[PDB]
Amino acid sequence: MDKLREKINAARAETDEAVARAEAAEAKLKEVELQLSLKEQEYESLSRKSEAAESQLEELEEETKQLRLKADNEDIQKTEAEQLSRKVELLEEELETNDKLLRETTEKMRQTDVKAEHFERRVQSLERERDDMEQKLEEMTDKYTKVKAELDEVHQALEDL
Amino acid sequence: MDKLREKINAARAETDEAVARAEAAEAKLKEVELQLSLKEQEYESLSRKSEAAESQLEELEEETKQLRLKADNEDIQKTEAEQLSRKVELLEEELETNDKLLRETTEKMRQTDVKAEHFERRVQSLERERDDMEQKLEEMTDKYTKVKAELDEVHQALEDL
Amino acid sequence: MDKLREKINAARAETDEAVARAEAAEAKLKEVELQLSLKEQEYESLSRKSEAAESQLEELEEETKQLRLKADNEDIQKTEAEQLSRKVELLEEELETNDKLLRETTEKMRQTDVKAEHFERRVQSLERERDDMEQKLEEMTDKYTKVKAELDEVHQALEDL
Amino acid sequence: MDKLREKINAARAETDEAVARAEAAEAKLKEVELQLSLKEQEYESLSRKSEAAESQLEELEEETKQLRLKADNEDIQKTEAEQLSRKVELLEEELETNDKLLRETTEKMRQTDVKAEHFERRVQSLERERDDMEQKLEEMTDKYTKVKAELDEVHQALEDL
């Protein structure tokens, strides 16, 4: 009849609509499942890359601390070398001054030694001359005493006549 | 009745099967959509983290290079500092030796000056004594000559008797 | 005297004889005349009687002839009467037979009329019942056709499921 | 003498007169005697004739009475025959009328029989048709009940769907 055929058409329409819904939903489900699996694989790859990167970061931080210590030591040594160069210059100036002073003092000592030697040679010559003239004076005094006594005796002799 | 009831049963079963499959597919599609959204969010967060890690890696690598620049020169700088320190110690030893030599030279100069003053005073005394001896010798010689001449004149006069 | 007396005696005797004979003859003549007269009278009377007898004889003879005319026909007339009486009795018997046949025919006609009325009433009742059955059969056939068509339409619609 | 002769003449005259009387009387007597004898013979003949005539009269009277009886019987029979002829005519008329009536009644009975036979044949045909349609109505009623129950069951089945 009319109503029975209409109900049958409605039943077939409901069934076909459900089948179309199922087909579309299954297609979209397949697509999203493939997308989810691919995104999980990408996340795993990126996580392994991040682990490697963090390991490299730790290693680089350790190396950086070591190099910081060594570079600070190098800078300390460089400052020390600069100050030692300046100190070398100062000490060389002081040594030049003191060496000039030492040479001047040595020359003055040599001059004083020459003066002392001159005076000592004068002493020796004066002593020689003094001894010689002292002996000569003794001789002449004896001779004069003798001849004066003789002359007085001769005068006393000629006085009586 | 007969195959009419069989037909309505089979049609109802097919319709219910289609509806159930559609509902299950739609529910699973919603679930996988939600899971994919969450996975995308966490993957984006991990990507941001990995980018930050890479930036830190590059910064640390550049710092490591800049620090190696001085860390490699640490030892050569230490050698240069040791050379300059040895030069400084040599200059200091030379200064101390010069100080000692200057002290010794000054001491010897003072001693020689005292010796020269002593010898000069001795020269003065000896010159005074020598002049005194010479004057006395001249006087004694003159007196001896006078007395001898008088005696000889007397003796000569006696011959003409 | 003598022969005179004889003569007178003889003459007287002859005369007396003649007279006596004459008287006797006359007396006998008178007697025979009277007898003849009486005989004539009685003969005339007898003649009258005989004439009357002859007249009566002729009358009776004529009457006898006239009566014989019918007396001879008596027997033939009786035969004719018997024939007519037999015809009458035959007609009477035919009338009685016709009366009996008419009674029987009327009785049978009444019986047949009653039979015909009975059959006519039976025809009326049977026609009423037949029309009732026909109407009911038409109605039942129409309703069966309607229900069968509806069932077939339903079953046809079920095939297109 | 004169007187004697006169007496003799008178005697002879008397004798002759007596003789003449006797002769005449005897002649007349003979005649009348012959007449009387002849009349007696005639009377005897006529008397015998009269006796014969009276005998014939008696015989004729007896015959006449017999013929009277027979002729009266003949006349009675003739009247009877005439009346029987009239009665024959009357009875023939009555028989003709009654025979016409009998034939009319027989024809009416035949017509009534034809009518009754017509009605009886109608009865038989109507009974045949009634039985046929009654069986057909039973069949159709059963079929309609069955198909109506089936249709109601199908409606109840499709109602639940």
Author numbering:
A (entry chain A), B (entry chain B), C (entry chain B), D (entry chain A): 1 to 161
What text comes from the article?
Native, unacetylated TpmCdc8 yielded crystals in space group P1 with one homodimer in the asymmetric unit and a diffraction limit of 2.2 Å (conf-U1). Conf-U1 and conf-U2 have a straight coiled–coil structure, whereas conf-U3 contains a central 24° kink. In our case, the structure of an isolated TpmCdc8 dimer was predicted accurately by AlphaFold 3 (57) with a rmsd of only 1.56 Å when compared with conf-U1. In contrast, the electron density for the N-terminal methionine residues in conf–U1 is not well defined, indicating greater flexibility within the N-termini. In conf–U1, the majority of the interactions stabilizing the overlap junction are of hydrophobic nature. In addition, residues K7 and E159 form a salt bridge. Residue R12 of conf-U1 also interacts with the C-terminal part of the next coiled-coil, but here residue R12 interacts with the C-terminus and the side chain of D160. The overlap length for the acetylated conf–A1 is reduced (5.8 Å) compared to conf-U1 (9.3 Å), which is also reflected in different buried areas of conf-U1 (1531.1 Å2) and conf–A1 (1279.0 Å2).
Cables formed by head-to-tail polymerization of tropomyosin, localized along the length of sarcomeric and cytoskeletal actin filaments, play a key role in regulating a wide range of motile and contractile processes. All homodimer conformers are approximately 230 Å in length and exhibit head–to–tail interactions, where the N–termini of one homodimer contact the C–termini of an adjacent homodimer. Each of the conformers that make up the TpmCdc8 cables consists of two α-helices that are wrapped around each other, forming a left-handed coiled–coil structure.
